[PDB]
Every structure is written in C-alpha cells, then in structure tokens.
C-alpha cells in the first residue's frame, strides 16, 4: 500500500511501478495481467493505491 | 471570563539586539606565539562569515576575534576629529554603518568596507610588519569578488600566501567526514554539497537562497504586517535576528501543528511575548481569530503602555523555519526545498555519475549539517524524516550534527591550514603576481 | 559631563584613524569602481548557476494569519482562512493589501 510515485511500461506487457510510504519507497516487477487491473482501475502517478501481491 | 481570567500573569522576555561590548586590545601575545611556533606551521585563519568573521591562529583550538563584518565613519562635527570603526565598535552610537556584503548574499561586494574590517583584524591580532593567511570562500564564490579580495591582501597588506576553501566543507573535515551529503544552512544562503573520498563534487552542488539573514528579514516583514494599525516599538531586523534564534523550531508535521496553533486551548503555552521598552506615569473578543492572532488569550486594552509595547509571535514560531522546507509556499521563492534538494541530489544525480560506485549508500550513510541557522529544534529529525520517504525503504540513512554549527568551520580550516594539502594549494605573492588574482589552486575543499 | 566625556573617550579608544597600521602598504591605492553589485558583476561576466524551481504543486496558506486557506479573494488576490479575516482583508487601508503580497513577494506590479 502506498502513493505511486512511478508507472514505467517495461515492454511492448511488463510495467514496473514504484509505491511511497511516509517509511519509504518500493518498486515491484508487475505481470500484465495485475498490470491491467492496475490499469482498469484508473491508477495514476500520485495515487493511493493498495495491492496484494498473490491474490 | 475564567478561561482568561485565571490564567497566570503572562511570561515575557525582553527584546534582544546585537551591542557593542567591553573593549578587547590588540593580542600581542599572539603574534609573540606565531614567531615562536615552527617554520611553515603558522598562518592567520580568517572565515568570513557574514554573520561573524571569524579570525585567529591556526595553532589555536578556537578563534581570536568573531567581528560583524561591518564598518562606521562619520564626524561629530562639534570635535571636529573624524571617527571610524569596523566590526563591533559599530554600536551594532550613531549606528552610522555600512556593510562588506551585498545585502543577503553569499559574496563581498563593499571592499572598502572589507578592507577596513582586515585593517581591524590585523591591528587586534598584534600585526607590527609577512603571514600566511587561511580565507573562507562562498560555494562558486564570483571570479572578481575572489581578485578583489586577493588584491587586497597582496597588494595592500602584501602576505607571502593565501589560500581560499569553502567554510562547510571545512566543517565536515573538522568533523571525520569522508563520504556524504554536506547540507548547509548560513546566514547568506543553504547549500547541499556532496562529498566523496573527502572530494566535494561542486558540479553537483546546489544552493537554496534562504538563510539566517532571510529569516530574520521575513520574520520583520510579518512582525510589521501583524501590527499594521502600528507598534511603538522601532522594529528592527536586528531584533527578529535574536527571536528567530529564541524562538524558532521546525515542526516536525507542520500542517497538523498549524491548523490547531490558534485554538485558545493550550495557546498561553503555544504563544511567546518579547516586551519592547516602555515608560508610564456574542460577539467578543475571546471569540476571534485576530486577536488570538495579535494578543493571545488575555485582554486588550491599549492604555497598558507594557501591553502595547508587545509582540506576540505564534505562528511566526513555526511558519518561520519553513520557509526552508516550503519556499514557494509561505515566501514565494522559486525554488526546491531542501528535502526535495537533497532528495534530487541522492536519487537523480549521484546514481548517474560515472564511476562514483554505490550511489546514493556511500554518501546517504552521512548526511551531515553545518552552519548556524541548521540549529533548529528538530531540523535533523524533520530533514531524516523527509528523506526517508524519499529513499528506497530500509536504506541506511543517518543525519548528523557538526559538534558546533559556527566555529567548526574555522576549526577546520585551521587544522586544515599547514598540512601538505594546503601548503600544495598556497599560492604565493610571486605566484599571484605571475596569475594574478583570479588564480586558485584546485583542491578537494576549493572552488574548482 | 562626565558620562558624555567617557562616552567620547570610548569613540576615542574605538577609533581606527587613532590607531596607526604600519602593515598597511601606504602606496597602494584601489580603484574607485571596484564596488560592484553581484548583478553588475554577473552582467559584466558575460558554477554560481545552481537550482531551479519544484515542480511539486504547493500549498496554500493566509497572508494575514498564515493558517491553512482554501480560499482566494478574487478581488485583492489575498489568500484568506475564513470569513473573519476576510472581513479585515476587504477593509484594509488602501495600501496594506500589496503589503500582505509582497510578504510572499507577490505584487500587482
Ligand atoms: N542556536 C541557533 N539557532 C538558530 N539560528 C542560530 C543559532 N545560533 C545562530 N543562529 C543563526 O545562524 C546565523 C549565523 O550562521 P553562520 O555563522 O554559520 O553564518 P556565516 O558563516 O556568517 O555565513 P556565510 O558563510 O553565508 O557568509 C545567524 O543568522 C544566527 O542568527
Ligand atoms: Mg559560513
């Protein structure tokens, strides 16, 4: 859980994005499919958002 | 009435200014050990702090002399003999006073005024001509302030060598600096400077122009705008020197801490009062916002000579020191904080150089603060707080504090002064007059 | 009076024309111009360049009070907390308003 400081598309299917605490930040290696859901919900640079990673 | 009425008698604090202060003799004594200390192992170690100039002998543990780096001429025309003063012979009683650097800035610009200062210097430190001398710099100090200067000591006062290095990072080598982030906050300015393999890489160095002297003029301008209907007390940037000082903190969680900062709950404990001088012979008050704002929870009334010879400060404790983290915001200038600094130095910068190795862990394990106006109240916690969000989590990152803000850079200047370091970047009379005083032997605490 | 007489003989134990300073070369003259503004001197020039604005969306704060405001007068362009202070900012006398501006060094001009 935590703001989006970074959404970089890795190819052209894989997106890395980077997720903030007030404790620090994080990157996560997304599949295209969590990506998708990340992108069917309308997340952007400077969102809040929270994840689980398996489900 | 209660919640005022049985409050205790407020505390107020008398108003603080710079002043002169009991005469001090030329150092004779000094001179006496310079002569005797070993061959190549002496030199006069000024800083120039345009706050305090700072001077001494580098086989000395603190400074001589710490003199405002201001002058005063003028004729009581009654005695007709002419007067003139430089530092703190300046009343700061005429206060006819002019100073050596432009107003706020890092750089000498009145070399009169600088000169007059170094004639002062050197009578205190017992000169009787041939010394070397170890001067301070600002960060990418101007090519023509560094000739002027030079100038003037060759050709005025004609010493066998100078050498010119910047004061923070004297400090963090007085301190056993060796990788790091140097942020200084001065009176002129702040600076982040990192250091590696004891190299400040100033190709990467960024300044942010607020400072000591910003605040205490920021802290006037909104002293004048809370009592616009007018005050009777001279306010004076001087005195909001001495209460930003006194008073300041940085807040740790600045929005949470102002938007309750005027609640009359607890505002007697929140609120501090200075007492300028003074001589004698369902709507309410207690209801607003502006007189919490002006006066605190007690009455007001204006036949009180005392209480309207007062300043109350409040959210000036606080709005104050944030100028550094909010510069656009609560000042207007145009530029990054200092986390958002720091922040784009250890992230976006250090990682993109060649060959610099483990960026930012090298330099994030020593963030280290120097100068006097880092000496707020939670100033370190705030600055590791902001950067730790920044940085990937769990990073090691430490905030270190100089053992003393001030006269640590000119401790390190003089240990610096005589070592192989410094005697290799000396540069000599002859080589000035070869270079002239543009000249600057590049080294680890120089400009490049 | 003794006071004014020890005052002046303070001024007098201050002054630096009544000391003398033999180190100072006494041929050496400076030129007339050399005090120039840093402007001037950057001018005359033609790092010391080192930083630029934040990108970062700030925040708002009063001019008078410097609490939170969520509101900007759009007649004076003061920013405000609430209705009470913007009672105050609506009746200002006629210069205070490019006062509360220039604080943030804002301006009409
Ligand atoms: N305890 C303190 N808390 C806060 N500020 C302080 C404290 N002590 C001194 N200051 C402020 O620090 C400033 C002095 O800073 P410093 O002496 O490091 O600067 P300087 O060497 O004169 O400046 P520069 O290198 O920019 O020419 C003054 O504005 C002074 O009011
Ligand atoms: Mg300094």
Redesign the interface.
Known sequence: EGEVTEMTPEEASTLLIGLKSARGQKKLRLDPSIYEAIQKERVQVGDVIYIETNT | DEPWKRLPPPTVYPVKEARFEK?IPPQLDGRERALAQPPGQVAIVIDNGSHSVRAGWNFEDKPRLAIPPIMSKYR?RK?G??????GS?CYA?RSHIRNAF?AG?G?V????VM??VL??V??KLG???DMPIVMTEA??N????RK?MSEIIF????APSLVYGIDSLFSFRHNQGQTGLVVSSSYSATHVIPVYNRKALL?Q?????WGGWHMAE?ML??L??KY?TGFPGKLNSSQTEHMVRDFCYVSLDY?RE??G??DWTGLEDRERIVQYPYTEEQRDWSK???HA?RYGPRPFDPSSQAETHRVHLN??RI?VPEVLF?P??????????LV??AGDILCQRLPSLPGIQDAPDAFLRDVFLTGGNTLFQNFDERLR?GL????????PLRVRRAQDAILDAWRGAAGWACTEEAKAAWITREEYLEKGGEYIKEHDLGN? | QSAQAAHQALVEQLDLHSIHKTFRNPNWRPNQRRNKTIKAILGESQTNIESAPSLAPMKHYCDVTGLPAPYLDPKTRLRYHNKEIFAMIRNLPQGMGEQFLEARGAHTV
């Open positions: 005469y009581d005695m003999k002419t007067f003139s003063f430089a012979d009683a432009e800035t750089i610009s009145n070399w009169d000169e007059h004639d002062y050197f009578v000169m009787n001509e960060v990418a101007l090519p023509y302030s002027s050709e005025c006062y004609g190709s160095a960024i300044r942010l122009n920021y301008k909104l004048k705008l616009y929005d102002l938007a900062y005027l607003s916002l502006l704002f959210v000036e709005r909010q656009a915001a609560i000042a207007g200038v145009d530029q990054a904080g958002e600094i707080q730790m969000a920044l940085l990937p989590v769990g990073a490049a």
